[PDB]
Structure 1
Amino acid sequence: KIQDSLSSTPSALGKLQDVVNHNAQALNTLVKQLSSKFGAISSVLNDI
């Protein structure tokens, strides 16, 4: 019945999924922060 329980319930492996989910949005925010002007004329060094 272990195989049936694993194949039926789709949220049994939730602890392992959070570990890999928390390590993607961190990089996503770290790369999205590059579009902030930080109180400057522009966010592009070449333009400045």
Structure 2
Amino acid sequence: SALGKLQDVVNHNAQALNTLVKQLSSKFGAISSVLNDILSRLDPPEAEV
């Protein structure tokens, strides 16, 4: 681990992007994560909220 600093900068950047991309799958309380299902199986008034 002589090059710890350079390796660490690279790993932090990669991990940041990974978490940002992965968090799209989370639902945050909505009934589903994909937009299409929300707009398919529900009327517009409930799809808004």
Verify same fold: TM over 0.5. yes
- Bigger Cα Rg: 1
AA at the equivalent of 2:24: L
- Does residue 30 (structure 1) correspond to residue 15 (structure 2)? The answer is no
**Paired residue secondary structure (2:33):** coil
Superposed displacement of residue 28, structure 1 = 0.4
CA distance in 1, matches of 2:27, 2:11: 28
Identity %: 100
Cα RMSD of the aligned pairs, angstroms, is 0.6
Instruction: Mark the runs of 5 or more structure 1 residues left unpaired by the alignment.
Output: 1-10
Q: Number of paired residues?
A: 38
Give 4+ residue runs of structure 1 displaced > 4 Å after superposition.
none
Instruction: Mark the runs of 5 or more structure 2 residues left unpaired by the alignment.
Output: 39-49
TM-score scaled to structure 1, two decimals?
0.74
